[PDB]
Amino acid sequence: GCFGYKCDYYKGCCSGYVCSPTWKWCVRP
DSSP states (O other): OOTTOBOOSSSOOOTTOEEOTTTSBEEOO
């Protein structure tokens, strides 16, 4: 995966992962 990947609307996370609305990085749900 991609834990920590800094993400936003056009910078989506890897599959497995979702963009934390608190921290704006990729986490597992």
